[PDB]
Subunit: 119 residues, 2 copies
């Protein structure tokens, strides 16, 4: 529980990627998609720190940020909220809508099948 913005998702996704990332890694990475200033981005990092979503160690002189949060857990709780809002008909509404509308590759399709078979 407790919302995080689109921008915070971007920082977090990156920490869940390199596991440990310095402020500058994060700025370098992010600046590849979005045209944000370092100031802007440094702020986001601070808000997640102050917020307790992430913490930092200190390899060498440099500060490495890591997650104090359960990825699959927060994203999940986040999709639950997403569905409740948009798809009144539940999870299945979403999938039924995504399927008829997305031209899925045979591979993409198969990939979804054994995902359902694995318990």
């Amino acid at each position: 529980t407790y919302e995080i913005s689109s921008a915070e998702w971007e920082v977090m996704n990156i920490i869940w990627m390199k596991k440990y990332a310095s402020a500058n890694n994060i700025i370098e990475e992010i600046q590849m998609q979005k045209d944000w200033s370092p100031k802007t981005i440094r702020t986001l990092i601070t808000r997640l720190y102050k917020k307790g979503f992430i913490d930092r160690k200190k390899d060498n002189k440099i500060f490495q940020y890591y997650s104090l949060v359960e990825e699959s857990d927060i994203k999940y709780k986040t999709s639950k909220n997403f569905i409740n809002k948009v798809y009144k008909g539940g999870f299945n509404s979403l999938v039924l809508n995504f399927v008829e509308k997305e031209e899925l590759s045979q591979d993409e399709i198969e990939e979804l099948r054994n995902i359902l078979n694995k318990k």
Copy 2:
């Protein structure tokens, strides 16, 4: 591209259901669940009118708002953006997460198996 608030989703669904509807048809259908004021609810509609999500044919003296957006297109578009924001494995990755956490009875699982094959 606009980001529809949750309250706006509420109103769209009503219009998508009815197809054509007056501020009043909408205000009544919504006060049934929400303690939102007529002013609040009218403001919402105006907000979607301005966003191009809807329009109004003035049948009689009473405006009748109806959608300017295909509901299956609009939501699909929404999901695709919600997924890019949160998931970096696309749809498949979202779906996987949902299954691993949600206790989906085979009864439930099977139901999905079907959507996928049909």
